Amino acid sequence: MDYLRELYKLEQQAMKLYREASERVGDPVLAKILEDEEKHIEWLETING
């Protein structure tokens, strides 16, 4: 059992960087991407079914 753990350990890893870089990249679509990736963690734990 490792599928969703590899997804979590890439999607949260990307999310950390998307949230970090925002104040230094200074573009609005970075903030929009956080809202997209939030569904991709909620659906992630749903994929345990």
Next chain:
Amino acid sequence: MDYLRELYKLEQQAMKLYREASERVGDPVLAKILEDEEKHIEWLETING
């Protein structure tokens, strides 16, 4: 700026797997996820210059 390449190499690394696992897991939201991550490579290229 050497910033977005570290995000690219996580978003495209996740993409590689999201298209592979889909037929095995059999969930329609899994196929929706790889569709949403395409914008996250288009915008991630454009914002890199």
